[PDB]
Amino acid sequence: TYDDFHTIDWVREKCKDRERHRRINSKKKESAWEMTKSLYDAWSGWLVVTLTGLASGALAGLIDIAADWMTDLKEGICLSALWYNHEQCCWGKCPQWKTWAELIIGQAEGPGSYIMNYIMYIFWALSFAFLAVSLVKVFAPYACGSGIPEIKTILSGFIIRGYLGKWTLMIKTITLVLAVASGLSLGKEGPLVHVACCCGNIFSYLFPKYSTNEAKKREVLSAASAAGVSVAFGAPIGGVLFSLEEVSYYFPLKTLWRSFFAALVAAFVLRSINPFGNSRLVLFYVEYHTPWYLFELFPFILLGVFGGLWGAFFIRANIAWCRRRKSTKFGKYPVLEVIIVAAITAVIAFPNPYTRLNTSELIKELFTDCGPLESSSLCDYRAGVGVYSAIWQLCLALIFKIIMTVFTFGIKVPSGLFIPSMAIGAIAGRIVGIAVEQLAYYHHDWFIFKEWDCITPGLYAMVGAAACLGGVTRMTVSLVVIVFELTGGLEYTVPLMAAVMTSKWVGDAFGREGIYEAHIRLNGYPFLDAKEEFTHTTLAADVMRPRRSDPPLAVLTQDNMTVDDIENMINETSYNGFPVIMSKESQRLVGFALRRDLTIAIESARKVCFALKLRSILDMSPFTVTDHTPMEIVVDIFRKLGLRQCLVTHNGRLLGIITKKDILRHMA
Amino acid sequence: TYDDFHTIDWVREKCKDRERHRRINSKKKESAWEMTKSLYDAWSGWLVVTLTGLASGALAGLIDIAADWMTDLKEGICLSALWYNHEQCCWGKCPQWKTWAELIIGQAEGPGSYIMNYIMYIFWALSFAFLAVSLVKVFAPYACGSGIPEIKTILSGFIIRGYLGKWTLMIKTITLVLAVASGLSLGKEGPLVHVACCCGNIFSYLFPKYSTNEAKKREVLSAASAAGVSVAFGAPIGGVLFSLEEVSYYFPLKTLWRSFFAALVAAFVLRSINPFGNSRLVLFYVEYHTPWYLFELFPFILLGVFGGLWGAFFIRANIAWCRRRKSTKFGKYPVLEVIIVAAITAVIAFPNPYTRLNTSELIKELFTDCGPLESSSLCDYRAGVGVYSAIWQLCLALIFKIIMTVFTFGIKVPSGLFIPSMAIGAIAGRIVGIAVEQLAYYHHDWFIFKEWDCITPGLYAMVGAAACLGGVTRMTVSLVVIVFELTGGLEYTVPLMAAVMTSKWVGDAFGREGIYEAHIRLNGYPFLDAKEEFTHTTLAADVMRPRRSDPPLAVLTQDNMTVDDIENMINETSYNGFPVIMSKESQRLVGFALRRDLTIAIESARKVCFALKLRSILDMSPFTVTDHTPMEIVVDIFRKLGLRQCLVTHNGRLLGIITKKDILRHMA
Numbered sequence A, B: 001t002y003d004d005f006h007t008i009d010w011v012r013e014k015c016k017d018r019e020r021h022r023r024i025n026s027k028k029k030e031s032a033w034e035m036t037k038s039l040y041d042a043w044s045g046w047l048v049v050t051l052t053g054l055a056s057g058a059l060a061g062l063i064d065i066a067a068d069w070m071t072d073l074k075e076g077i078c079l080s081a082l083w084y085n086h087e088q089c090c091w092g093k094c095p096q097w098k099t100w101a102e103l104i105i106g107q108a109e110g111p112g113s114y115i116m117n118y119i120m121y122i123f124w125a126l127s128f129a130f131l132a133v134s135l136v137k138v139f140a141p142y143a144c145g146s147g148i149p150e151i152k153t154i155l156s157g158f159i160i161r162g163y164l165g166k167w168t169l170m171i172k173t174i175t176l177v178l179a180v181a182s183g184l185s186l187g188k189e190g191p192l193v194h195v196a197c198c199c200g201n202i203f204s205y206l207f208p209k210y211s212t213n214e215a216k217k218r219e220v221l222s223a224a225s226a227a228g229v230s231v232a233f234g235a236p237i238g239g240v241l242f243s244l245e246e247v248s249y250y251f252p253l254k255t256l257w258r259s260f261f262a263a264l265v266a267a268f269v270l271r272s273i274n275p276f277g278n279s280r281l282v283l284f285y286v287e288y289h290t291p292w293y294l295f296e297l298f299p300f301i302l303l304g305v306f307g308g309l310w311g312a313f314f315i316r317a318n319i320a321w322c323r324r325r326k327s328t329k330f331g332k333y334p335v336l337e338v339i340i341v342a343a344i345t346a347v348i349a350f351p352n353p354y355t356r357l358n359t360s361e362l363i364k365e366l367f368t369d370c371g372p373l374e375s376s377s378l379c380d381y382r383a384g385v386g387v388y389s390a391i392w393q394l395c396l397a398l399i400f401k402i403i404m405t406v407f408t409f410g411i412k413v414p415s416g417l418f419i420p421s422m423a424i425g426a427i428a429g430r431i432v433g434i435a436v437e438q439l440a441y442y443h444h445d446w447f448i449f450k451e452w453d454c455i456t457p458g459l460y461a462m463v464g465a466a467a468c469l470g471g472v473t474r475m476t477v478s479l480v481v482i483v484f485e486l487t488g489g490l491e492y493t494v495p496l497m498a499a500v501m502t503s504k505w506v507g508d509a510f511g512r513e514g515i516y517e518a519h520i521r522l523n524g525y526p527f528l529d530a531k532e533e534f535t536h537t538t539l540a541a542d543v544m545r546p547r548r549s550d551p552p553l554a555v556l557t558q559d560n561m562t563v564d565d566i567e568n569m570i571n572e573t574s575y576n577g578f579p580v581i582m583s584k585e586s587q588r589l590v591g592f593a594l595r596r597d598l599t600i601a602i603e604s605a606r607k608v609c610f611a612l613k614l615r616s617i618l619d620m621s622p623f624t625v626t627d628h629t630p631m632e633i634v635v636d637i638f639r640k641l642g643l644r645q646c647l648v649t650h651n652g653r654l655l656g657i658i659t660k661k662d663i664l665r666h667m668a
C-alpha cells in the first residue's frame, strides 16, 4: 500500500494486478464454481461502475431537490405542502406561496414588505453560508472548493487519504446544498464530479480487484468522474470526454469503455428518476432546432474572445486573491470570510432580479428564446426604454458575477465554477444577441439581413457560456459536447467549436494554464503536467539528488545486511524505498525494496539474504536510466509510464535515484 | 529519415523536434522579421490542418456529387441537363428523366422494358466495377480497400511510402466514385478517412516543421482522419473521437486540439458548400426530436445483440474469405474477381428495390419515419398482406447484404464497411421497429402500451445501425457520437449507448478483435496493440535476439573503427542501427548509430572517432533495459513511448538489442 500524500507508482500496481490475474486464473481451473467466481471477478469492473452511476444519479437528484428547496426558502414558504419549492407550489397570484414579508409584516407589497424581504433574504443567505462553512470546517475540511483540482491530482497517481471518503462525501453533499442555497457565486455541477468520485472510491472497497489496487481504483475514479459530469449536465458522452480531457490521466481503452458504461448508467438513472416530470435535462436546459446563418459565426467568434478575455482575467485575478488569503490574516478566518462574502453577495444581489435568481434559473432564462406570452424584463419588447433598461440590468449582473465569483471561488465551502462562468458567458451572449437582433430589424436593408425573427439570442447565450467556460477551463471537445448535451442543440456545434477555440486561444495569449491547473500550481500539489515541457537543457545527472551536499545514497546489499541493520535503516530513514545492490562497492542494481513492504515483512517474521529471506518483496525490475540521459527523456518516462522512481545508473554502476517529487521540485 | 516499410521511433523524432524548436528560438531573437517567421512556424500546425479540412470538404463534396450522378446513371439519363442525377431532375411522371429501356426499347413499362433495364443495370455495374478495379490495379494498387486498417498502422508509427501519396489520392477518389456507382456492397464514408489522410500528408510538405518530422506528420494525420470522418458523416465531434479511439495512437492533448480544429474546418466547409441546398447533413440524415419510453430500451438492447452477432460473424466469415483469396487461385485475378462480384451483386440486387437502391439512399429511407403522404412499400399500411410482404423484402435485403458484403469487402477496389454494416443494422432495426409497432397497436391492452403512433421504426433503425457498426468495428463513444451527429438525434443517446455496449459485448464473446484489427492480423502488418497484453510469462533476455544461434551482436567501437570498416559494416549488414560501444570487450553503451545517418555522413565526408568525427549523428541516449526485466515491462515501454529499439543490458554490459519488429514477431 501507500502512505498519505504519496504518489502511486503505476508500473508496480500494473504488475501486482497481473499477478492477481494469474492467481485468479490458477484458481479458475480448480472447479466450475471457481470459473463462476472468476467470471464474477471479471464483471467486478462493470458492477462497480454501475453502482457508482446509480449512486451519482441518486445523489445528484437529491442535491438538486434540496438545493432548489432551500434556495426558494429565501423568498418564502408554501402553506399547502411545506416541502414544496416556489415552482412546485405555483402549478400544484399564487396564494399558496407566502413570502417572509407576508408572514411577518402581513402585506405582500410596499416599502415595508420590500425591506422585510431584503432583510430576510440577507439573513437566510448568511444562515446557509454559516452552516455550510461551519460544517465543512468542523466535520470535513476537504469538502471545500469544487474539488476538481484535487481529483486531477488523485487521478494523476497522487494520494489524499480522506479526500474521497464517506465523511467528505456526506459533508460535501450537505454543505453543497447549503452553499448553493446561500446565494453565493457558485454551483453544484462541478462539485458533483467530486461527489461521483467519492461514490466510486466508496464502492471500490466492495470488490477486491479494485480495493487493494490503486491503478484500478484510478480507473474506477475516471469512470466516476465521467458519471458525475454526466449526471451534472445530463451529458453522458460529454462526461466521458470530460474525464478523457480534464480529470483522468491514463486511458488504455478500458477506462474509456468503463467511463462509457458509467456515464450511460448515470444518464439512465437520471432519466428514470424524474420525480416531478422535469423533462429539462437539467434546470438550465433549452431545446434548439432552428438554423443559423454563416454571418452569425462572426459575432460568435467575438464571444469566444470575451471568454478568453474573461477566463484569462479570472485566472489572473482569482488566483491572485486566493494567494492573498493563503498568505494574509484573511486565511486565519474561514467562517468569518464566508459570512462576509455571503452577506455582501446577498446585499448586492437582492436588488437586481437576475442576480437575485439562483444561477441555474438565470442560465435557463438566458438560454430560453423569447416567447410571445412571456413578458419578462429579459424579453420585454414594445423597442424602447425597456430594452435599454434590460440591457443595463444584464450588464450590472455581468459585472456583479465577475467581481463576486473572483472573490468567491476559493472560500471554504463547496464551490463550483461551471455555473458562475457559464452564467457570465450567458449574460454576455444574451447581451450580444439582443444587440444583434436590434441591429437586424433596425438595419434590415443591409445585405446580410436582407438576403438570409432572424436571430435567436438564446443561441448567442449558449455560445457565450461555452466561450467563457472554455476560456476559464480551456476545454475544447468535452466543453462543446457538454454544452449541446446540456441544451440538446446538436445543430449549433460549429458555432460552439468556433467560440471555444477562439476563447482558448485568447486565453492562452495570457497564459496557457486553466483554472484547475492554476489551483494545483497555487496549492502546490504534486501534479506532473503533460502540457508543460522540460524546456530547460539539462541532463539526468543534475536532477538526481544524491548530490555532493547530500548524504550517501541509502542502499542495501543483497546478503551482507542483517535484520537489525535493515530495521535501523527503516526507522532512522524516512525514505520509502532502497536500491538493493550486490555490495557497497559493486553497486549493481539487484532490485528495489519498498520501506512499507520491508517493515511489514520484518514485523511478520518477528511476530537477511535477498538472494531472513526478503526476495518475496524485492523489486527485481527497477526502472533505470543512464546518467547521461537528457532529463526531458526521464520526464517523458515518468509521465507516460507513471513511475515513482527511476534509479539512474552510470556505466552499470548505481549512481543514484530520481523520484516524481524530485522532478516536480526541479520544475519549480 | 526512414526507409520503406520501416517503423517510426517516436522518441528520436520528438528530440529532433526539440532541437528544431531550439534553433528556431535562436533565430527568433535575430530580428523582428524573425519573430514574425517564428510566429508563422507556430501557426504552421493550424494552417496545415486548415488546408486539410478545406481539401477534405471539397473532395468529399465532389465524390458525393460524382458518385450520385454515376449511380443514377445506371437507371437512365436526364434530357434537360445531362449533368443532373435522378433527383436533381425530378424537382428541376418525370418526363425529363429517361431510362435505358425508354432510350433503347422506347417503352417505359412492359416485360421488354424490364428485361432491358435489367441488362443495362447489370452492364453499367460491370462497367463501373471494371473501371475501378482496372484503374486501381494499374495506377495505384494502394487505393483498394477502405484503407483504415493501414492508416491505423501508419498512425502507429509504421511507414508505407506511397500509401498516402498523390497517385493514391487521385486513383482512390476516381475508383471510389466508380465502386460506389458500381452497386457493390461498399461505401465511401470509410474511404474518406484515407482520402483525408492523403490530403494531410500532401499538405504536410508545404511546411518544414511537419515535412521532415514523422511524429508531427502523424499528428497531422490524426487531425486529417478526424476531418475525414467529420466530412464523411457531418460529425465533427464524432470524427475527433473516431481519431481518438480508432485510428490515431498518441494524444498529448495537442493532437486533440488540432483534431478539434481540423474537424471544425471540415464541418464548416461542408456547411458552406451546399451546391444544391441539401440540408441533410449527409444523404442519409434524418432529424429526430421525439421522445422514447423506458420499455423501448429492452428491444434496443436486443438489437445490440444482433449487431454483436453480426459483427462477430462478419469478422469470422469475411476474414476467412480474404485469407482464401490471399492463398488460392482467386488472389491471382483481381479484375476478374471484381467483375464477377459486381455481376452477381447487380443480378441479385436489381429485383429487390431495397437492394437496387444505393445503400446511402436505403439508409436514408430506413432512418426516415413514415409520413402520411408517403406510400412506399417500406411504409405501406392499410395492416395486411402488404406489411408482411414489405417485411419479407427487408429480410431478403438483409440476407443479400450480409452475404455480399462478406464476399465484397476485401476486393481490390475502394471499399468501405461503414455503410454496408450500417445498412444491415438499419434493415434489422426497421424490421424490429415494424414488428414492435404492430405489437403496439394490435396489443394496446398491455400495460406497457396502455400506460405510456407510439413507436418510431426510424429510431429502431438508427439503433440497429449503431448496433451492427459497433459489433463489427467495436467502437463505443466515437460510434455513438457519429450516429447522433449523422442523424441529429441527440435525444436518443442512451439507447445508442446501450445498443453499442451490448453489440460490443456480444461481439467480444466470440473474439475481441474488430474488423480493422483482423485486417492487420490477416495482412500481417506490424501493429503493436494496446488491447492485447503479453500474457506470456517471459523475460526480456529471451525475446532479445542476438541468440546463440544468431551471429555476434553487430556493434561499433567508439574510436578503434576506421571509415572503411564502418562502410563495410553498412554495406554488408542490412541493420538500420548499431550500438556504438567503448570497446569490443568493455561493451559499454556509448550511443546508437543509425545506418542511414552513418551512410549519409560518410558519403558527405568523402564527397573514425565517435568521441572522421561521427559524434554529430551518434545517439548518446539509447533506451536501455535490464536483461532480467520482464518482457511485459518492455512491451509497455515500446507501446507507451513508441520506441523502435531498446538495447538490453546485463549488469551494464551491453547484452543485445530488441526492436518493435522483434516483439511483434514473438507475439505471433
Ligand SMILES: Nc1ncnc2c1ncn2[C@@H]1O[C@H](COP(=O)(O)OP(=O)(O)OP(=O)(O)O)[C@@H](O)[C@H]1O
Pocket (backbone or CB within 6 Å): A005, A006, A007, A544, A545, A546, A552, A553, A554, A555, A574, A575, A576, A577, A578, A579, A644, A657, A658, A659, A661, A662
Ligand atoms: N534510497 C534513497 N537513497 C538516497 N536518496 C534517496 C533515496 N530515496 C529517495 N531519495 C531522495 O530523497 C528525496 C525523495 O525521497 P523519498 O523516496 O522519500 O520521496 P518523496 O519525494 O518524499 O516522495 P514519496 O512520499 O512519494 O516517496 C529525493 O531527494 C530523492 O533523491
Ligand SMILES: Nc1ncnc2c1ncn2[C@@H]1O[C@H](COP(=O)(O)OP(=O)(O)OP(=O)(O)O)[C@@H](O)[C@H]1O
Pocket (backbone or CB within 6 Å): B005, B006, B007, B544, B545, B546, B552, B553, B554, B555, B574, B575, B576, B577, B578, B579, B644, B657, B658, B659, B661, B662
Ligand atoms: N545492431 C544489431 N546487432 C545485432 N542484431 C541486431 C542489430 N539490430 C537489429 N538486430 C536484430 O535484427 C532483427 C531486426 O533488425 P533491424 O534493426 O534491421 O530491424 P527490422 O526488424 O528489420 O526493422 P526496421 O526496418 O524497423 O529496422 C532483430 O532480430 C534484431 O534483434
